[PDB]
Design a protein around this nucleic acid. Sequence first.
DNA 1: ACTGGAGAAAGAAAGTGAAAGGAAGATAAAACGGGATTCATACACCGTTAAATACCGGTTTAAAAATCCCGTGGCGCGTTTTAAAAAATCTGTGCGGGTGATTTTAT
Length: 67
Amino acid sequence: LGCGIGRDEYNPDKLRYHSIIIMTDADVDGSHIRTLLLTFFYRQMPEIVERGHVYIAQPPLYKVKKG
DNA sequence: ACTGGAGAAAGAAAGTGAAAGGAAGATAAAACGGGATTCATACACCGTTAAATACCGGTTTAAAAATCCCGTGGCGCGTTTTAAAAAATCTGTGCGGGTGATTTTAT
């Protein structure tokens, strides 16, 4: 991410990407990992969430064929 | 001539691999101290007796005990410090289903 941490050198103006996308698996463990990542992002880097640099992807789970 | 982009030089600040050495550990050789045997030899217990000591009666006298006056330092009180012990609060960890990953050899 290249922003630092610890609020002593944590500068939110050095973010190397203006769009961060979370893309895990489509089952429940993906949901658990998503919750863990959201907890980390909210507790450690509030400004990134406030400015709107976090997104969520939605991959499919099933594929159906008939002919 | 002038402008602005771009590539190359040059210079300074940060990360790096290697460094005696020394306190901090670690590991062996040595000196020590505490049990099992083995007796010869000195020690414990029993009769006999001369002698050394305990005891009583009455002095005494010099020394120690008893008594009075006083002037202090050594205990007692109140109030603070300061370690020491106790109660309270954090830190790891393993049990069993789940998610995802690493390494060395032969031909």
